Design an enzyme around this catalytic site. Structure first.
Site, PDB file in Angstrom:
ATOM      1  N   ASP A 168      -9.867   8.621 -14.565  1.00 49.62           N
ATOM      2  CA  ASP A 168     -10.917   9.252 -13.779  1.00 49.62           C
ATOM      3  C   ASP A 168     -10.818  10.757 -13.636  1.00 49.62           C
ATOM      4  O   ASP A 168     -11.798  11.465 -13.874  1.00 49.62           O
ATOM      5  CB  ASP A 168     -10.997   8.616 -12.398  1.00 49.62           C
ATOM      6  CG  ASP A 168     -11.106   7.118 -12.459  1.00 49.62           C
ATOM      7  OD1 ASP A 168     -11.544   6.563 -13.488  1.00 49.62           O
ATOM      8  OD2 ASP A 168     -10.755   6.486 -11.455  1.00 49.62           O
ATOM      9  N   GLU A 198     -14.921   1.934  -8.327  1.00 49.04           N
ATOM     10  CA  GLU A 198     -14.021   2.238  -7.223  1.00 49.04           C
ATOM     11  C   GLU A 198     -14.779   2.168  -5.887  1.00 49.04           C
ATOM     12  O   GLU A 198     -14.223   1.793  -4.847  1.00 49.04           O
ATOM     13  CB  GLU A 198     -13.431   3.618  -7.438  1.00 49.04           C
ATOM     14  CG  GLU A 198     -12.601   4.097  -6.311  1.00 49.04           C
ATOM     15  CD  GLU A 198     -12.051   5.455  -6.600  1.00 49.04           C
ATOM     16  OE1 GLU A 198     -12.547   6.432  -6.006  1.00 49.04           O
ATOM     17  OE2 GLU A 198     -11.132   5.537  -7.442  1.00 49.04           O
TER      18      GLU A 198
HETATM   19  N1  LIG Z   1     -15.552  -1.103   9.833  1.00 48.36           N
HETATM   20  C1  LIG Z   1     -14.964   0.023  10.225  1.00 48.36           C
HETATM   21  N2  LIG Z   1     -15.648   1.078  10.690  1.00 48.36           N
HETATM   22  C2  LIG Z   1     -15.163   2.322  10.755  1.00 48.36           C
HETATM   23  N3  LIG Z   1     -13.932   2.591  10.315  1.00 48.36           N
HETATM   24  C3  LIG Z   1     -13.138   1.602   9.872  1.00 48.36           C
HETATM   25  C4  LIG Z   1     -13.671   0.330   9.837  1.00 48.36           C
HETATM   26  N4  LIG Z   1     -12.782  -0.576   9.474  1.00 48.36           N
HETATM   27  C5  LIG Z   1     -11.659   0.140   9.291  1.00 48.36           C
HETATM   28  N5  LIG Z   1     -11.880   1.453   9.488  1.00 48.36           N
HETATM   29  C6  LIG Z   1     -10.972   2.562   9.237  1.00 48.36           C
HETATM   30  O1  LIG Z   1     -10.729   3.092   7.947  1.00 48.36           O
HETATM   31  C7  LIG Z   1      -9.352   2.725   7.770  1.00 48.36           C
HETATM   32  C8  LIG Z   1      -8.836   2.107   6.518  1.00 48.36           C
HETATM   33  O2  LIG Z   1      -9.314   2.840   5.414  1.00 48.36           O
HETATM   34  P1  LIG Z   1      -8.314   3.820   4.607  1.00 48.36           P
HETATM   35  O3  LIG Z   1      -7.607   4.695   5.561  1.00 48.36           O
HETATM   36  O4  LIG Z   1      -9.056   4.376   3.452  1.00 48.36           O
HETATM   37  O5  LIG Z   1      -7.146   2.877   4.087  1.00 48.36           O
HETATM   38  P2  LIG Z   1      -7.128   1.666   3.059  1.00 48.36           P
HETATM   39  O6  LIG Z   1      -8.446   1.004   3.004  1.00 48.36           O
HETATM   40  O7  LIG Z   1      -6.119   0.878   3.752  1.00 48.36           O
HETATM   41  O8  LIG Z   1      -6.702   2.514   1.739  1.00 48.36           O
HETATM   42  C9  LIG Z   1      -5.518   2.269   0.970  1.00 48.36           C
HETATM   43  C10 LIG Z   1      -6.003   1.499  -0.231  1.00 48.36           C
HETATM   44  O9  LIG Z   1      -7.151   2.018  -0.956  1.00 48.36           O
HETATM   45  C11 LIG Z   1      -6.643   2.058  -2.305  1.00 48.36           C
HETATM   46  N6  LIG Z   1      -6.325   3.445  -2.818  1.00 48.36           N
HETATM   47  C12 LIG Z   1      -5.695   4.331  -1.912  1.00 48.36           C
HETATM   48  C13 LIG Z   1      -5.414   5.661  -2.225  1.00 48.36           C
HETATM   49  C14 LIG Z   1      -5.761   6.113  -3.492  1.00 48.36           C
HETATM   50  C15 LIG Z   1      -6.375   5.287  -4.443  1.00 48.36           C
HETATM   51  C16 LIG Z   1      -6.386   5.790  -5.904  1.00 48.36           C
HETATM   52  O10 LIG Z   1      -6.478   4.946  -6.796  1.00 48.36           O
HETATM   53  O11 LIG Z   1      -6.182   6.999  -6.076  1.00 48.36           O
HETATM   54  C17 LIG Z   1      -6.668   3.956  -4.100  1.00 48.36           C
HETATM   55  C18 LIG Z   1      -5.848   0.754  -2.468  1.00 48.36           C
HETATM   56  O12 LIG Z   1      -6.180  -0.405  -3.265  1.00 48.36           O
HETATM   57  C19 LIG Z   1      -5.168   0.599  -1.123  1.00 48.36           C
HETATM   58  O13 LIG Z   1      -4.144  -0.338  -0.785  1.00 48.36           O
HETATM   59  C20 LIG Z   1      -8.687   2.505   9.102  1.00 48.36           C
HETATM   60  O14 LIG Z   1      -7.336   2.733   9.449  1.00 48.36           O
HETATM   61  C21 LIG Z   1      -9.783   2.792  10.086  1.00 48.36           C
HETATM   62  O15 LIG Z   1      -9.545   4.070  10.669  1.00 48.36           O
END
Ligand SMILES: Nc1ncnc2c1ncn2[C@@H]1O[C@H](COP(=O)(O)OP(=O)(O)OC[C@H]2O[C@@H]([n+]3cccc(C(=O)O)c3)[C@H](O)[C@@H]2O)[C@@H](O)[C@H]1O
Ligand SMILES: Nc1ncnc2c1ncn2[C@@H]1O[C@H](COP(=O)(O)OP(=O)(O)OC[C@H]2O[C@@H]([n+]3cccc(C(=O)O)c3)[C@H](O)[C@@H]2O)[C@@H](O)[C@H]1O
Ligand SMILES: Nc1ncnc2c1ncn2[C@@H]1O[C@H](COP(=O)(O)OP(=O)(O)OP(=O)(O)O)[C@@H](O)[C@H]1O
Ligand SMILES: [Mg+2]
Lengths: 271, 246
Positions: B50, B158
């Site tokens: 990417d 993605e």
């Molecule tokens: N429905 C809701 N409404 C509003 N906000 C919501 C929510 N539910 C959770 N959240 C929140 O968002 C959160 C979780 O999302 P986030 O922090 O993104 O965290 P998360 O979804 O846990 O992101 C990590 C992951 O995304 C992937 N990833 C990560 C980094 C880089 C790349 C790459 O390939 O370079 C891929 C991967 O498969 C992995 O285990 C929470 O902790 C919370 O604050």
């Protein structure tokens, strides 16, 4: 009309019923929590009017949820960069908010490690303004770290009076999960705090970002060049001077990128 | 149809003309930079498919603008946490400038501070998200210092799964790869003449779903569930006036 369009897009009501607004916004917080199954909220408490109001709303939502038999908690976090000039105001805010938990995370060592690395990698030193944005983004990281560790959603304090000027750091304080204060002008927010019985000091003080080392506690009006009262009159649909309209409509167009998801070629708002 | 709704919202095309896609996307970058008056772009280069694709499109866009007599530059930045493929990518992209920002000291300081303040150690997962968000800060620090726009590498494959960190690699200013499936991006890289080492449920299954091809109910149900669960990552923060979250 531009004023009319900006009002609808920012969801501003020219006239509010303070009591109903609180009920609506607390209910929004509760509904969102239930829908997502989240455990509650986390919000940085600065001692300023906006986080004080959002903070109190989050505590009321959380208590209301528990009262109904639910499970929810609220963690208020102090995020000073070393010593906060108005730390006493932040403590006052906490005394008013009465959060379930009061945590602290000093962002200074993280920002210092970053700046040092920046100078080491580029030979250049971060400007005061750019370092200020690193501080705001570091606070978002601290809140998301706490939220991720504890299963909580991150509240944002954005409201119409700052959305109109794009007066927040993209992915810094602008990075949040939900915004309980959306559509409220600055004076309407103050009206809500008065309804909630907040100490006047918290809403009488000058709004500040407090991100600069050279000019700590610099007032928003100082950086903006328009007062919050002129901004609110505009948002509330009052006929304002052409000098206010002109300045605000120009600022609004230039900061549209801050109010939209990243731009793609299939997006028209930027053309 | 959910598959059709998703496909429409993510702007995926069932088939593409790789040559024309490159042209349109390069044009989008040039057009956006010109509208805004920015000085160019900054992109973290990881050695992955990417960022290699986004990077080459950015370099082509910047060279196109200078050709028209404008002023634009592209800064590719390696963001290690304390490299062979990243080096291959750089050799292919040939950015105007190639920088590096090691995020280890920033992440360590944050990590130690978290433990000191809370008594808890940041788990691997949460620490992974701190790394992604620190990379975002570094790109914006550079962008802010140099007057550049931050490119994001998000694309359809993605985006459906929400597989990125909110305000981490998801925090960007423009998205040149929007609407592309994983396999379509591979096609663009081949067309660009990238070495195979750079572009080489089932990720191919996700692509089939996005391109409107028939997939099993297992694939569909899985993706559609993950899609609704990650809507929050594809929208601005929710407010009571928003409907998508209900
Ligand atoms: N429905 C809701 N409404 C509003 N906000 C919501 C929510 N539910 C959770 N959240 C929140 O968002 C959160 C979780 O999302 P986030 O922090 O993104 O965290 P998360 O979804 O846990 O992101 C990590 C992951 O995304 C992937 N990833 C990560 C980094 C880089 C790349 C790459 O390939 O370079 C891929 C991967 O498969 C992995 O285990 C929470 O902790 C919370 O604050
Ligand atoms: N048109 C465009 N399309 C897409 N992206 C665009 C863009 N123009 C710039 N950008 C990007 O946006 C960036 C500029 O946005 P941003 O990084 O937010 O930075 P910027 O607006 O320059 O600084 C943030 C500002 O909001 C303020 N603020 C921040 C934090 C808190 C508070 C408070 O009162 O507490 C106030 C602050 O005092 C300052 O005036 C650029 O570096 C760039 O990467
Ligand atoms: N010193 C800090 N401590 C804790 N949280 C912080 C800190 N500084 C900023 N924040 C947060 O990031 C935000 C954006 O700051 P901003 O200054 O716009 O709001 P505020 O200080 O609550 O009110 P005002 O806008 O009236 O100054 C918050 O409202 C708050 O949640
Ligand atoms: Mg403040």
């Amino acid at each position: 009309s531009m004023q009319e369009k900006i009002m609808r897009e920012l969801h501003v009501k020219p006239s509010i019923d303070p009591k109903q607004e609180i009920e609506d916004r607390v209910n929004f917080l509760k509904q969102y929590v239930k829908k997502t199954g989240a455990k509650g909220f986390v919000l940085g408490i600065s001692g300023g009017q906006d986080s004080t109001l959002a903070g109190r709303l989050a505590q009321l939502a959380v208590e209301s949820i528990r009262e109904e038999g639910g499970d929810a908690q609220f963690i208020a976090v102090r995020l000073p960069h070393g010593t906060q000039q108005d730390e006493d105001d932040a403590q006052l805010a906490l005394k008013f908010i009465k959060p379930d938990k009061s945590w602290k995370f000093d962002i200074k060592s993280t920002v210092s490690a970053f700046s040092d690395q920046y100078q080491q990698e580029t030979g250049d030193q971060l400007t005061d303004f750019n370092k200020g944005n690193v501080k705001a983004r570091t606070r978002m990281i601290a809140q998301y770290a706490i939220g991720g560790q504890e299963g909580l959603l991150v509240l944002g304090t954005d409201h119409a009076a700052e959305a109109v000027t794009g007066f927040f750091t993209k992915y810094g304080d602008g990075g949040a999960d939900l915004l309980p204060l959306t559509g409220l002008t600055k004076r309407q927010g103050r009206t809500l705090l008065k309804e909630l019985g907040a100490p006047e000091r918290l809403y009488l003080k000058e709004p500040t970002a407090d991100l600069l080392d050279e000019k700590p506690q610099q007032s928003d009006e100082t950086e903006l060049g328009i007062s919050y009262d002129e901004i609110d009159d505009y948002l509330e649909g009052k006929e304002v001077s052409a000098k206010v309209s002109e300045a605000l409509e120009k600022r609004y167009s230039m900061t549209e990128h801050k109010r939209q998801v990243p731009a793609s070629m299939f997006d028209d708002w930027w053309k």
